[PDB]
Design a protein around this ligand. Structure first.
Ligand code: CLA
Ligand code: CLA
Ligand code: CLA
Ligand code: CLA
Ligand code: CLA
Ligand code: CLA
Ligand SMILES: CC1=C(C#C/C(C)=C/C=C/C(C)=C/C=C/C=C(C)/C=C/C=C(\C)C#CC2=C(C)C[C@@H](O)CC2(C)C)C(C)(C)C[C@H](O)C1
Ligand SMILES: CC1=C(C#C/C(C)=C/C=C/C(C)=C/C=C/C=C(C)/C=C/C=C(\C)C#CC2=C(C)C[C@@H](O)CC2(C)C)C(C)(C)C[C@H](O)C1
Ligand SMILES: CC1=C(C#C/C(C)=C/C=C/C(C)=C/C=C/C=C(C)/C=C/C=C(C)/C=C/C2=C(C)CCCC2(C)C)C(C)(C)C[C@H](O)C1
Ligand SMILES: CC1=C(C#C/C(C)=C/C=C/C(C)=C/C=C\C=C(C)\C=C\C=C(C)\C=C\C2=C(C)CCCC2(C)C)C(C)(C)C[C@H](O)C1
Ligand SMILES: CC1=CCCC(C)(C)[C@H]1/C=C/C(C)=C/C=C/C(C)=C/C=C/C=C(C)/C=C/C=C(C)/C=C/C1=C(C)CCCC1(C)C
Ligand SMILES: CC1=CCCC(C)(C)[C@H]1/C=C/C(C)=C/C=C/C(C)=C/C=C/C=C(C)/C=C/C=C(C)/C=C/C1=C(C)CCCC1(C)C
Lengths: 151, 104, 139, 170, 174, 69, 169
């Protein structure tokens, strides 16, 4: 048995079919991620990705930022995470302007209208996920420490 | 258990090749095959008169009683578990090779 | 004359050295050749492949890759039956080499000389003489 | 939002009317959101104690909500024909063969749910300053004249702009 | 089609009506993650162990075997296990159950192969299932009783972890 | 220190057993060469008895270590 | 087959063989020659059958030259090891005579000889089955007696008639 084969039956394309690349488990994960999942509008793809990324962004800023030992650390962690999100949304916006020409179609990410929808969703989701992480950390003492409240 | 020793879901270790991972049989057999020799006792302070498997099981029990507190650096838990896991991984690897490849 | 797209490719197990997205959106090159044997050669992009007895066909990203393979087949397997094509994503296939059926190192009638300068290289014009002028430095 | 609010509205009123045997002894005289705070103080993880009322409610409600969550996902993607809110819970026949119910009844559910959302919000906010609860506040049409003391909510920062920017009559 | 247990949810595809104990209850869709035949055997094996455990807890409170009291004087349920591990009573049981499970592994392989029905070891010495109509009731009753026994076993041991007295003593004096 | 013993007939017994064990094993597992009367030569005998003195020395020392002697 | 009913019939054994119960759960019969397995079963059983009485006899009567050793099993330590070596060599030499140059599975059965038969007699299937089943019981019994004598440090007959203490180590 051989686990490595040419990519999509083509021996001369610059890729290989390896278990990491093209196993059934890998195919299931890639196909079900919001970027690639079927039946999702570009805006909804942006929302789901945004919620995930904004939620984890708050934590490193809060625990390791300059104001970490202060009593305003969570507020600083939220503002710095929000500041990063605002910069990232601008990165998405400028990419959309140069990369895609204007066309009628709006149902795909790699279209000017579609990329704009993805940016709108990602902005709202990142603000929403960062806000959710803020509420949870503000109220639950386990999250404020590293779980160190139990010891 | 992505696929068991049966033709359930159409699993493919790669693009077009289906391959039955024998996760029940290999995991069970590797676990038992490693554990029975590992029971061998030894009057060494790390084991404490038990075998490696029994001492590792005892170490989980003693550290689970102090559930939030982790085992310390000099605690025998870290040595017992690392050796037991290393042997288990090796017998799982060798078991997967033997069963999937030789098929008998 | 035109590329028969159905020619079987030489057996190959794949590599990462093959062509990328630029081949499917800008241009691709193809090479065909006849082999009297089912023999192993080296791919320009990686490891070893096996050319099948009869007609072979490859796809590469660069013209230099097709010609480096051509040089190899001629030097080792004495295969002078190689034809190199350019393929555009529109489907247009452009025959490239040998351009008029005869190798470039052999003279052929009906070839018109391009780039030939009537004097020797030391007789070119100084840059100052042709400054703010469209006149070419080759005399 | 409506269904929870409807329960919440009745629950606040009923808590004033009477309490189940033995509850008064443990909690004391706390009235609305304050009882949620007190119970949490006496439960593990949230606090130190031998109670688990809030945690038990969350565990059983959470198990129900995970199943409904799968339903929401399936309806959203169009896999299921189920209309919104139609979980099939009509043990006593009312819809006469369908748990979904008639348009007249569903209009009553939606409008009562909206009304309950506003009403429960009012009751919570009135407990925040008067500390009277629904029935007592209703009895005291002139209020701020008398305020029943209420322990501070778990979220107390929100009640900090009463004295400095607002008048702070209470 | 909709699940009979959860009306709002769609019917789990991996499950089928023929299977004993089927109510359509797989809200999380765990049957997709692993083979149904493996899960079916796993459920019955858990059921049989749980049924024995629940009966054992009730029986242990009602009576003890001759001379058991001398070795264990006050320990009631989980407590007797630690002293009898040193006495080797639990050690001997472990050995024989493990010995049966070795043949259990071969049976599990036969199930996955598809020749063997899940959970069937052909142990019917008294011919209870001979009629083939009593068999369907028995198969269902086993699955249902085992499910209740899993809930019961956990419920009883946790009651012991709080009030150390055992299930029957808890019922008599709370 | 692991406890070893002066040579006795028990030590000899272990050595003899191990040597014979390896002679039979070598008749079975030596891939390039009347169960013992086909193709049995001096390099095969000298190899199986060399492994016999290695297996036998290890067995003697280990049985001395644990108390079997 | 019939012994372990929730498993398949081995299909390498039949009731023609003396001790057939259909018992091959690990499928050993498929992996190795049945003739070798049958030969091994009868031979291991014969040695064990001799062993069980060999454990029982020293407790009552022992040879004058040798010392008792305090246990029928423990006696191997007390007796001269040259005696044990003579037994080891003698058994191997007898095996070379009984199997005429056949010490390997391919060489054995080349003559067409049945595994059990060494030419002492020809027997009925009822008789052959009796031999195998006594041998199987004896092998298990030998393991039990040897460990009992080892753990107790006392004779089998003495322990049965006397304290009957649980084997402990
Ligand atoms: C650690 C345990 C262990 C070891 C040492 C072996 C060793 C072996 N197995 Mg087994 N096997 C195991 C576990 C193990 N197996 C389990 C758990 C299963 C069941 C799932 C099987 C099922 C199985 C089958 C079905 C077959 C084998 C076969 C084999 C042999 C050759 C194929 C092979 O795996 O190459 C391994 C090669 C070697 C081990 C020798 C190379 C020497 C180097 C130093 C390897 C060392 C690796 C590692 C460091 C050792 C770890 C030991 C310990 C600390 C864990 C070899 C004797 C085949 C065979 O020959 O049949 C008899 C065969 O058909 N095995
Ligand atoms: C989470 C809210 C809550 C709290 C903190 C309590 C707490 C209590 N209840 Mg109440 N109870 C509740 C909800 C609550 N109950 C509900 C929802 C009902 C159903 C209507 C009851 C019905 C109830 C009755 C009928 C009685 C209590 C009694 C008691 C006391 C138990 C005395 C005893 O011997 O314990 C052991 C109690 C039991 C095993 C069962 C009771 C205790 C102070 C008893 C009491 O006041 O006795 C002093 C009593 O008679 N409770
Ligand atoms: C693992 C469980 C367990 C344990 C630890 C014991 C332990 C004991 N049993 Mg009991 N026994 C058990 C299970 C157990 N038994 C079972 C399952 C049965 C069958 C119903 C019996 C039937 C039994 C009898 C009939 C007798 C003992 C007796 C004894 C004692 C032996 C004292 C002596 O001189 O001999 C000892 C304390 C003896 C004793 O002293 O009890 C009265 C005795 O005569 N046992
Ligand atoms: C067959 C299932 C079963 C049964 C009949 C019982 C029955 C009982 N359990 Mg056990 N229990 C079970 C399963 C079961 N449990 C399971 C699966 C768990 C999770 C591990 C528990 C965890 C548990 C705890 C932690 C406690 C009980 C308690 C109780 C008692 C009070 C009833 C109660 O709190 O309900 C309340 C019912 C409602 C509020 C619904 C209205 C009662 C004797 C309590 C007790 O008094 O025992 C010490 C107690 O503290 N049980
Ligand atoms: C019946 C046979 C027999 C017995 C009882 C033993 C027993 C032993 N041997 Mg020996 N051995 C044997 C056969 C035997 N061996 C054979 C056939 C060989 C091949 C020649 C060896 C070669 C051998 C070497 C080379 C060594 C041992 C060592 C050991 C001892 C410690 C091993 C240990 O715990 O390391 C645990 C170590 C780990 C890394 C495991 C984790 C152990 C008492 C070692 C020792 O210390 O002896 C003094 C040692 O160095 N043995
Ligand atoms: C010079 C001695 C000698 C020789 C050449 C043989 C030859 C044979 N015997 Mg015999 N045997 C002998 C002595 C011998 N035996 C003695 C003293 C005993 C104890 C009573 C046995 C018990 C015995 C049984 C029970 C069986 C055989 C079998 C066999 C045959 C296949 C195995 C083999 O080649 O032997 C390899 C063995 C030896 C050369 C000597 C073995 C002596 C014992 C077993 C000591 C073993 C020590 C230890 C357990 C090994 C550990 C290995 C590892 C952990 C290091 C073959 C005809 C098998 C068969 O199928 O026969 C047809 C069979 O079933 N023999
Ligand atoms: C569905 C289903 C079933 C069921 C069921 C159940 C449990 C149904 C429960 C329904 C309930 C509880 C409905 C309650 C709605 C509350 C409203 C509209 C009031 C809002 C308050 C206002 C406007 C106010 C106010 C106020 C302000 C702010 C100031 C306060 O100081 C005081 C004051 C009060 C004056 C069953 C089992 C029957 C079966 C059936 O087959 C199907
Ligand atoms: C070959 C053949 C013939 C012959 C012959 C020969 C040499 C025949 C010899 C046959 C022999 C020696 C048979 C011995 C069988 C022993 C058994 C079944 C086990 C018993 C003990 C048990 C079950 C037990 C136990 C115990 C355990 C484990 C633990 C203890 O705490 C307690 C306890 C003691 C109860 C001749 C030559 C005559 C002619 C013929 O042409 C061919
Ligand atoms: C348990 C717990 C807590 C809690 C809690 C809870 C339950 C808090 C409740 C919060 C709620 C429900 C607040 C309601 C806000 C409604 C407003 C402002 C008006 C809406 C309607 C409008 C504007 C109508 C507009 C209009 C009208 C007039 C009609 C015309 C059209 C229209 C435009 C629609 C805490 C926080 C105390 C913590 C503590 O640890 C314990
Ligand atoms: C899904 C659904 C529902 C439900 C439900 C739920 C939530 C059911 C929950 C079931 C649970 C959580 C059972 C838990 C444990 C079982 C145990 C611990 C057995 C333990 C053996 C032990 C501990 C021995 C341990 C030990 C031994 C002796 C050796 C010493 C050490 C020691 C550790 C002490 C409803 C109610 C809505 C109904 C609805 O129709 C369907
Ligand atoms: C675990 C693990 C094990 C094995 C290996 C592994 C896989 C690599 C590893 C995984 C590791 C990893 C990488 C795990 C990563 C996990 C992550 C990043 C999880 C993110 C979760 C985001 C949430 C819950 C956002 C919620 C936002 C909400 C609810 C909206 C709230 C809001 C909206 C808009 C509505 C209004 C209110 C507000 C509050 C404003
Ligand atoms: C000292 C000495 C002298 C010279 C050197 C030497 C040769 C190396 C050494 C010899 C040492 C010797 C002679 C050592 C001999 C050791 C022996 C004979 C050990 C016997 C072990 C038998 C066991 C564990 C039975 C297990 C039964 C099981 C698992 C279950 C069976 C079951 C199945 C299959 C089916 C039905 C159910 C039941 C019945 C329950």
């Amino acid at each position: 048995s051989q686990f490595i084969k040419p990519y999509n039956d083509d021996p001369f394309v610059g890729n290989l079919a390896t278990p990491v690349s093209t196993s059934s488990f890998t195919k299931s994960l890639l196909s079900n991620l919001p970027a690639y999942r079927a039946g999702l509008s570009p805006l909804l793809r942006g929302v789901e990705i945004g919620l995930t990324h904004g939620y984890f962004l708050v934590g490193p800023f809060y625990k390791l930022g300059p104001l970490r030992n202060s009593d305003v650390a969570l507020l600083s962690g939220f503002f710095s995470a929000l500041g990063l999100i605002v910069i990232l949304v601008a990165c998405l916006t400028i990419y959309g302007v140069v990369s895609f020409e204007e066309t009628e179609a709006k149902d795909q990410l790699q279209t000017a209208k579609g990329w704009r929808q993805f940016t709108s969703g990602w902005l709202v989701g990142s603000v929403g996920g960062a806000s959710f992480a803020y509420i949870l950390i503000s109220n639950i003492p386990f999250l404020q420490t590293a779980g160190m409240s139990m010891l | 258990l992505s696929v068991v020793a049966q033709s359930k879901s159409d699993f493919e270790i790669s693009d077009g090749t289906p391959y039955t991972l024998n996760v029940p049989l290999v995991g069970a057999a590797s676990f038992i095959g490693w554990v029975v020799p590992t029971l061998l006792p030894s009057q060494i302070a790390l084991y404490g008169g038990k075998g490696l498997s029994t001492a590792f099981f005892a170490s989980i029990g003693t550290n689970l009683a102090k559930f939030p507190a982790p085992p310390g650096m000099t605690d025998p838990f870290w040595l017992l578990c690392f050796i037991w896991h290393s042997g288990l991984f090796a017998t799982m690897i060798l078991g997967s090779i033997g069963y999937n490849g030789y098929a008998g | 004359e035109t590329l028969n797209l159905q020619i079987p490719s030489p057996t190959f197990e794949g590599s990462t050295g093959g062509w990328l997205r630029a081949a499917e959106v800008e241009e691709k090159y193809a090479i065909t050749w006849t082999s009297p044997k089912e023999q192993v050669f080296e791919m320009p992009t990686g490891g070893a492949a096996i050319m099948r007895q009869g007609e072979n066909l490859l796809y590469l990203a660069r013209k230099e890759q097709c010609l480096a393979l051509a040089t190899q087949v001629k030097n080792s397997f004495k295969i002078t039956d190689y034809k190199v094509y350019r393929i555009f994503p529109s489907g247009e296939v452009q025959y490239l080499h040998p351009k008029d059926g005869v190798f470039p190192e052999k003279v052929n009638a009906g070839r018109v000389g391009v780039g030939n300068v009537s004097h020797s290289i030391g007789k070119n014009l100084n840059p100052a003489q042709i400054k703010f002028t469209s006149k070419s430095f080759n005399g | 939002h409506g269904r929870v609010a409807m329960l919440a509205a009745a629950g606040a009123i009923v808590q004033d009317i009477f309490t189940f045997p033995g509850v008064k002894s443990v909690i004391g005289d706390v009235k609305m959101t304050s009882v949620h705070d007190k119970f949490l103080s006496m439960e593990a993880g949230s606090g130190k104690g031998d109670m688990a009322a809030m945690h038990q409610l969350l565990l059983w409600l959470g198990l129900l909500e995970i199943a409904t969550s799968v339903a929401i996902i399936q309806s959203f993607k169009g896999e299921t024909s189920r209309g919104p809110g139609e979980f099939g819970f009509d043990p006593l026949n009312f819809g006469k063969g369908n748990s979904a119910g008639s348009d007249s009844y569903k209009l009553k559910e939606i409008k009562n749910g909206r009304l309950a959302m506003i009403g429960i919000g009012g009751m919570v906010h009135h407990y925040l300053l008067t500390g009277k609860g629904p029935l007592q506040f209703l009895g005291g049409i002139p209020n701020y004249k008398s305020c029943v003391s209420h322990p501070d909510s778990l979220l107390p920062w929100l009640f900090k702009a009463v004295g400095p920017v607002l008048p702070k009559i209470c | 089609a909709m699940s009979e247990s959860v009306p709002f949810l769609k019917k789990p595809e991996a499950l089928d009506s023929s299977m004993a104990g089927y109510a359509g209850f797989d809200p999380l869709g765990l049957s997709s993650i692993a083979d149904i035949k493996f899960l079916q055997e796993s459920e019955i094996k858990h059921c049989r162990i749980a049924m024995l455990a629940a009966a054992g807890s009730i029986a242990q409170d009602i009576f003890t075997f001759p001379g058991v009291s001398k070795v264990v004087g006050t320990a009631k349920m989980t407590g007797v296990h630690d002293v009898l591990v040193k006495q080797g009573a639990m050690g001997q049981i472990l050995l024989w159950t493990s010995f049966l499970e070795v043949f259990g592994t071969i049976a599990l392989l036969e199930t996955l192969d598809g020749k063997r029905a899940p959970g069937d070891f052909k142990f019917d010495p008294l011919g209870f299932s001979k009629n083939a109509e009593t068999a369907k009731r028995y198969q269902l009753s086993e699955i249902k009783n085992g499910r209740l026994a899993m809930l019961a076993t956990g419920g009883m041991v946790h009651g012991y972890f709080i009030t150390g007295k055992g299930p029957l003593e808890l019922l008599t004096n709370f | 220190v692991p406890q070893t013993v002066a040579w006795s007939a028990k030590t000899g017994a272990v050595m003899v057993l191990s040597n014979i064990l390896c002679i039979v094993a070598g008749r079975y597992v030596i891939q390039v060469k009347s169960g013992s009367f086909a193709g049995f030569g001096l390099p095969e005998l000298l190899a199986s008895t060399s492994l016999g003195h290695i297996v036998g020395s290890g067995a003697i020392l280990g049985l001395s270590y644990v108390g079997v002697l | 087959n019939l012994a372990v009913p929730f498993l398949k019939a081995p299909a390498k054994l039949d009731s023609s063989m003396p001790g057939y119960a259909g018992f091959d759960p690990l499928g050993c019969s498929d992996f190795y020659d049945v003739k070798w397995l049958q030969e091994a079963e009868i031979k291991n059983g014969r040695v064990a059958m001799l062993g069980v009485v060999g454990l029982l006899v020293p407790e009552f009567f022992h040879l004058p030259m040798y010392t008792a050793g305090a246990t029928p099993y423990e006696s191997y330590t007390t007796v001269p090891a040259f005696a044990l070596i003579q037994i080891f060599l003698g058994c191997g030499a007898v095996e070379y005579f009984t199997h005429k140059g056949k010490i390997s599975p391919d060489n054995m059965f080349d003559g067409g000889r049945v595994p059990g038969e060494f030419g002492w007699g020809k027997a009925d299937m009822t008789m052959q089955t009796k031999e195998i089943k006594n041998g199987r019981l004896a092998m298990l019994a030998f393991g039990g007696i040897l460990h009992q004598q080892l753990f107790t440090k006392m004779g089998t007959i003495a322990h049965l008639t006397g304290g009957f203490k649980p084997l402990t180590f």
